[PDB]
Amino acid sequence: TRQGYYIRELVDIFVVGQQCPLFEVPGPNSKRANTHIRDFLQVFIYRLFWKSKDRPRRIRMEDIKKAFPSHSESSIRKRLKLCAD
DNA sequence: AGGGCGCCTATAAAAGGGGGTGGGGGCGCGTTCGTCCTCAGTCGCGATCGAACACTCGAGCCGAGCAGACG
Numbered sequence: 001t002r003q004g005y006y007i008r009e010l011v012d013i014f015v016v017g018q019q020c021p022l023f024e025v026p027g028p029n030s031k032r033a034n035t036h037i038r039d040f041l042q043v044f045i046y047r048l049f050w051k052s053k054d055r056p057r058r059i060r061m062e063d064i065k066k067a068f069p070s071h072s073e074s075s076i077r078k079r080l081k082l083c084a085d
Numbered sequence: 086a087g088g089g090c091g092c093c094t095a096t097a098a099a100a101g102g103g104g105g106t107g108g109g110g111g112c113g114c115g116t117t118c119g120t121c122c123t124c125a126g127t128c129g130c131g132a133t134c135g136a137a138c139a140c141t142c143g144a145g146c147c148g149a150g151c152a153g154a155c156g
Contacts, residue, residue, distance in 0.1 A: 034146060074148065 041068060041079050049083075059084070 026032040044067060048059045064076050 029146095031145075038146085072148070075146085078146095 038075070038079065041071065041076070044068075045079055045083075 026036070041064075045059070045064065048063060049057045052058055061073075061076065061080075065071075065073065068076070
């Protein structure tokens with residue numbers, strides 16, 4: 001860590017074979033992919049509103065632009081359309 | 086024991102029935118040939134349904150442009 005080194009011994013190590021997947025990874029540009037993209041952004045926006053101390057709760061746009069910098073700001077504008085002014 | 090007698094022999098002919106033997110015919114008859122015939126297997130559909138592929142449309146997401154207000 002930042003403060004120093006720490007040492008443990010280990011005695012047990014597992015080898016994991018070939019995985020049998022139980023969850024389907026979406027494809028690129030899929031409907032499930034884009035749904036997750038906007039849902040994740042919406043959850044981050046709600047949790048930034050919960051963390052806000054001023055009443056009424058207020059956030060800044062460039063916090064979201066620091067978190068999601070590949071997003072066009074139009075997508076963020078629409079996620080803020082419903083729930084913020 | 087031996088002379089005379091009986092017999093078989095060759096010869097003709099008839100008469101009639103009986104018996105023996107060989108051949109032919111009958112007939113039935115047994116053997117051989119013809120004919121039916123159905124089941125089993127193959128295949129050929131072709132009946133049916135299920136699965137795949139193609140097409141259309143609807144919805145969702147992203148980007149861009151315009152409007153409004155602050156600086």
